[PDB]
């Protein structure tokens, strides 16, 4: 409860009813917030046989925020899928590979009580696929091929689904 109050109207008078019709609750308030959150709903650290490091979280949460001004609640969602991934090719020399898939979804439903008008008000479906593979040519010179794919999605009708892809090699020379 972000801020409750004492109602001056719940005093002593022979006037126990408000405008619409009620009994003048003693504790006025507004915006009761229930926040639920599976931070790692499941996390699966997965250090495999040779080297196949894996770390796939699943975050999640809800943010019910019922306000007593207009009497309509607002639910928010989590769904932050993550898949880490690591491997090492050997002596081709060594080639370190990392891959970080991720998928974030959202919602901001505004739900009316007195009739079914639960309507969407925000959202995202951004998933990204960073993927690097680096290889050293000597003590000084290294290369790394990186590939960063990313795709947004229209949850609301004013988001303009992006898709953007960075690629190409990056060398590196350490003196």
């Amino acid at each position: 409860i972000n801020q409750f109050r004492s109602n001056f109207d719940y005093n002593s008078s022979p006037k126990v009813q408000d405008v619409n019709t009620n009994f003048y609750n003693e504790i006025i308030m507004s915006n009761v917030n229930l926040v639920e959150q599976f931070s790692p709903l499941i996390r699966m650290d997965f250090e495999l046989k040779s080297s196949l490091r894996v770390l796939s979280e699943i975050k999640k949460d809800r943010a019910l925020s019922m306000s007593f001004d207009n009497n309509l609640l607002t639910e928010v969602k989590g769904m932050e899928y993550i898949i880490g991934l690591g491997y090492r090719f050997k002596d081709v020399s060594d080639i370190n590979i990392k891959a970080d898939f991720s998928l974030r979804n959202n919602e901001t439903l505004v739900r009316y009580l007195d009739y079914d008008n639960n309507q969407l008000a925000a959202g995202q479906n951004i998933w990204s696929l960073k993927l690097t593979a680096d290889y050293s040519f000597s003590k000084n010179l290294t290369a790394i091929f990186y590939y960063d794919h990313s795709f947004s999605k229209a949850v609301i009708s004013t988001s303009f689904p992006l898709t953007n892809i960075r690629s190409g090699f990056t060398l590196r020379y350490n003196f």
Binding site: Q3, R5, N7, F8, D9, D18, V19, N20, N25, I28, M29, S30, S67, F68, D69, N70, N71, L72, Y112, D114, Y115, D116
Partner: protein, 577 residues
């Protein structure tokens, strides 16, 4: 507004918004206060008001939604009418100390002055005025300083009342100052406007509501037009805006004097405490990473002298290339006696030859002398140890330094106009700043217009029936996208991209004198307005539309301007080509 987006003095009743809603927003309030044992309320709260929605049905095809409005009080409407009292509800006695923090007392000196030609801090009559005689002990505008004239200095240092006042601004953290962020608040609805009027008044024939019946003395000081008129207005009432209020506020200085520069180039700072330069290690120390010069001189530490500091920062982004020609002869006469040269020429290089006012270029040349004769005075060390318990044989020195350093300024000959040092106080180059409006998508259909007054129905603009858009032709606004010109879609002959209503106007036609950059958009987009006054337009059930003379129909397109108040925007012209 969340409780962190405003404040309010909960004893005098003024909101203190944190975002300056000034583009014709609407700002209502509902509040609830208590005069002692009673409870009042001049709004309607969410937890008190009529409910948001009320349905009266069971299916989507028989529900009757009813939304409800929550009557409130208005503090400024959209259309800022100056006559209406919602205008007066705005509070015009708050002056925000520019770039201020929690301005603690004793580091804040406010001082009102009257710069008629120059800053003088007492009001004088005008040619026989002779301010109204026998003033009360409170008003007394005869010789009193302006802080007393403005009822802003009547308390001692300890905020208990004193006869004439401590001479200093009072700084009551609720009444006269919003300590958290600047905001000197004068203790009157309108100090410069009506306080001075009632304090210079000389009878009852004078009234504040009519500027024609003024004293001829309160006709030079009563600045009524900043309280009865906007701030962009009252520029035309210019002969009265001479009541500046200078002041000084200090920063924290907790760690040390925060210079204001980061990563100072070493050996640059010069902290001349009271006129005499201080030694870089014996009485002050600099961080060189944070600013924060720190005077470790205990006597000079707690003295309140204005320790000034020259910095030599190197974080200039966007300055003029400077050149630092120079040298310094350094002759060594018999040991511990030298002589100096130090010729120097620092020359700015202006960006353009049209050196504007303030951004001026310098061509200065300094040349000086030196001195610095040193000596030991063993006579004086003997004098020292020819005293009581003193014993030390540590040496004694009598260094003596001197300099002259003539300076001769100039202005770089690049920024000359016919052989002079022009500065161009105003080359009329910044005037006429434009705001674009040919964005083909930000427009939209328009309500049917009126023509002569709010009483003519040339376009059926008052018809409340469906006979409202009968006179709407088929206006279509757009811009020919670049696909037609670059890569002809199948169907448009090249004789279609050439008939002077679809041509891809290059900027070399409109602006043949402008030099478009390379690689940038050489093509002047348009806002084509193809109007079909016979094509029935969008929505209208016009039954005939065949006898209607097409010179009677319109086609409309309305926008929404990003910035209202053309007064303080100074919008003057609607240009177009």
């Amino acid at each position: 507004l969340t409780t962190n987006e405003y404040t309010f003095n909960p004893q005098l009743g003024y909101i203190s918004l944190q975002q300056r809603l000034a583009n014709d927003e609407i700002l209502a309030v509902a509040f609830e206060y208590t005069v002692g044992g009673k409870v009042y309320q001049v709004g309607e709260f969410g937890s008190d008001g009529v409910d948001a929605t009320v349905v009266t049905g069971n299916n989507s095809s028989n529900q009757a939604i009813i939304t409800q409005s929550l009557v409130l009080k208005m503090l400024k409407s959209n259309l800022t009418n100056v006559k209406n009292p919602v205008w007066n509800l705005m509070m015009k006695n708050v002056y925000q100390i520019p770039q201020a923090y929690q301005i603690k007392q004793d580091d804040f000196r406010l001082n009102i002055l009257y710069t008629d030609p120059s800053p003088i801090n007492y009001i004088t009559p005008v040619q026989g005025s002779s301010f109204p005689p026998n003033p009360a002990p409170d008003s007394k505008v005869e010789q009193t300083p302006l802080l007393n004239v403005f009822n802003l200095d009547r308390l001692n240092y300890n905020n208990d009342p004193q006869a004439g006042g401590d001479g200093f601004f009072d700084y009551i953290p609720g009444v006269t100052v919003d300590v958290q962020n600047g905001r000197v608040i004068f203790t009157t609805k309108e100090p410069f406007g009506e306080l001075i009027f009632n304090k210079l008044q000389t009878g009852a024939g004078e009234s504040y509501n009519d500027p024609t019946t003024y004293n001829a003395n309160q006709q030079k000081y009563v600045f009524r037009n900043m309280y009865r008129n906007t701030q962009a207005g009252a520029l035309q009432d210019s002969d009265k805006n001479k009541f500046l209020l200078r002041g000084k506020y200090k920063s924290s200085g907790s760690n040390g004097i925060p210079i204001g520069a980061f990563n100072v180039p070493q050996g640059s700072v010069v902290v001349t405490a009271a006129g005499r330069v201080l030694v870089e290690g014996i009485d002050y120390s600099v961080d060189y990473q944070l600013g924060r010069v720190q005077i470790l001189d205990p006597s000079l530490q707690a003295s309140n002298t204005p320790i000034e500091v020259s910095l030599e920062n190197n974080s200039i982004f966007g300055q003029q290339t400077r050149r630092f020609m120079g040298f310094n002869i350094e002759h060594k006469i018999s040991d511990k006696f030298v002589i100096g040269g130090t010729y120097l020429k620092m020359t700015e290089r202006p960006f353009t030859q049209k050196s504007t006012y303030g951004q001026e270029s310098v061509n200065n040349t300094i040349f000086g002398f030196n001195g610095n004769y040193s000596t030991e005075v063993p006579f004086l060390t003997r004098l020292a140890n020819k005293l009581p318990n003193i014993d030390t044989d540590v040496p004694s020195n009598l260094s003596i330094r001197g300099e002259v350093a003539f300076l001769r300024p100039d202005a770089p000959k690049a920024s000359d106009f016919q052989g002079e040092a022009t500065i161009y106080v105003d080359d009329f180059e910044g005037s006429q700043s434009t705001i674009d409006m040919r964005s083909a998508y930000a427009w939209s259909l328009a309500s049917t217009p009126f023509i002569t007054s709010i009483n003519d129905n040339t376009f059926n603009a008052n018809s409340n029936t469906l006979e409202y858009g009968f006179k709407r032709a088929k206006l279509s606004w757009y811009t020919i996208d670049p696909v037609f010109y670059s890569s002809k879609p199948s169907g448009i002959s090249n004789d279609d991209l050439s008939l002077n209503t679809t041509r891809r106007i290059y900027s070399r036609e409109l602006y043949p004198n402008t030099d478009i950059a390379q690689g940038q958009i050489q093509v002047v987009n348009t806002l084509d307005l193809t109007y079909y006054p016979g094509e029935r337009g969008p929505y209208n059930n016009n039954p005939s539309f065949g006898a209607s003379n097409p010179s009677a129909n319109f086609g409309g397109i309305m926008r929404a301007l990003n910035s209202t108040n053309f007064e303080q925007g100074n919008v003057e012209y609607i240009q177009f080509w």
